[PDB]
Design a protein around this ligand. Structure first.
Ligand SMILES: NC(=O)c1ccc[n+]([C@@H]2O[C@H](COP(=O)([O-])OP(=O)(O)OC[C@H]3O[C@@H](n4cnc5c(N)ncnc54)[C@H](OP(=O)(O)O)[C@@H]3O)[C@@H](O)[C@H]2O)c1
Ligand SMILES: Cc1nc2c(-c3ccc(Cl)cc3)nc3ccccc3c2c(=O)n1CC(=O)O
Length: 316
């Protein structure tokens, strides 16, 4: 297993990265320091995660310590939904750069295809609890992302939570300047994404799997919900390899030619999650894990099911 995958800009992206959603500001600095110590070279960030300054502190410290140089790191962030207007994109990117204390990003994603009303609130609601959309569209936001590459703020651009028709919309845009390098989507044994992965890989778009452990810490989660880490069937596959369930869940997407971004703030788990280059899941293991698919999403963006650009009505 080579540890990096080639993108359409000639850069190589580490297949294992550290996720940072729900990593509290008061713990994520240490998590990122430990991750860098440990061997992680890819960090998945976002403005909406409300912790980019603290991620940036950690990166700065490890650069100052001479542990890594900037060129060896692969830093990803994402344009939040309240900044889809073409006139807001550059400022949103530069705010992320300032918080991260960086002068470029390796990859910048449109976080979701849905634009939300601009303003201070990340999830702006009306008096009846509906997300308030903005009058923005995918193609105009993409053109504004392209400008960030031309100006040297970001090395590559991509998308996240786009269905195949929304990807197609960008690919088919007259006067396209950059193709999306990556589509970052939820993917794990309960949502295996066979059709969208086949689509993206066939189009030369690298897929990153988010919530690979099933996001047990997500804020809506209902107790009766399926639980990957607790799945006794996956526990048995792990036991046969002398690995943990989490390690099996991380290795799984790696063997599908995906990038994967497990999140932890716990030092032992950060280290555990990186120790996935010393074993292989068998053909049968892969087939068995794939067979657990239920089309079950932990990040369904239910507040936005009426949005014109809601991505999950389509089959894929
Ligand atoms: N583009 C998008 O829309 C989007 C959406 C969702 C996620 N993401 C990205 O993907 C990342 C990963 O997804 P996620 O945060 O939803 O969830 P996840 O990585 O599937 O699961 C994270 C949870 O698993 C725990 N954990 C981690 N390693 C473990 C291990 N070895 N053993 C047991 N428990 C373990 C963590 O606990 P502790 O942290 O307490 O150790 C945390 O509660 C995010 O952080 C974010 O960077 C992107
Ligand atoms: C899927 C997702 N949901 C939320 C949610 C969220 C999740 C589930 C419900 Cl039902 C409503 C909102 N809230 C946040 C609050 C503050 C900071 C970040 C979030 C986020 C958030 O960052 N994500 C992750 C993402 O979009 O990457």
């Amino acid at each position: 297993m080579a540890s990096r995958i080639l993108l359409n800009n000639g850069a190589k992206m580490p297949i294992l990265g550290l996720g940072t959603w729900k990593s509290p500001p008061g713990q994520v600095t240490e998590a990122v320091k430990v991750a860098i110590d440990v061997g992680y070279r890819h960090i998945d960030c976002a403005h909406v995660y409300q912790n980019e300054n603290e991620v940036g502190v950690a990166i700065q410290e490890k650069l100052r310590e001479q542990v890594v140089k900037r060129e060896e790191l692969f830093i990803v962030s994402k344009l939040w939904c309240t900044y889809h207007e073409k006139g807001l994109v550059k400022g949103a990117c530069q705010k992320t750069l300032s918080d991260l204390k960086l002068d470029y990003l390796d990859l910048y994603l449109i976080h979701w295809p849905t634009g939300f009303k601009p303003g201070k609130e990340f999830f702006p609601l009306d008096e009846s609890g509906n997300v308030v959309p903005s009058d923005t569209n995918i193609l105009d936001t993409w053109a504004a992302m392209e400008e960030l590459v031309d100006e040297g703020l970001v090395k590559a651009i991509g998308i996240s939570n786009f269905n195949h028709l929304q990807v197609e919309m960008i690919l088919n845009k007259p006067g396209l300047k950059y193709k999306p390098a990556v589509n970052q989507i939820e993917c794990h044994p309960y949502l295996t994404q066979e059709k969208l992965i086949q689509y993206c890989q066939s189009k030369g778009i690298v897929v990153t799997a988010y919530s690979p452990l099933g996001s047990p810490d997500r804020p809506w989660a209902k107790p009766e919900d399926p639980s990957l880490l607790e799945d006794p069937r996956i526990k048995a596959i792990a036991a046969k390899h002398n690995k943990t369930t989490a390690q099996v869940l991380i290795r799984f997407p790696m063997q599908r030619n995906l990038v994967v971004i497990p999140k932890s703030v716990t030092p032992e788990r950060i280290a555990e999650n990186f120790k996935v280059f010393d074993f292989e899941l068998s053909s049968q293991d892969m087939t068995t894990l794939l067979s657990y698919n239920r089309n079950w999403r932990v990040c369904a963006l239910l507040s936005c099911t009426s949005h014109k650009d809601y991505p999950f009505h389509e089959e894929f």
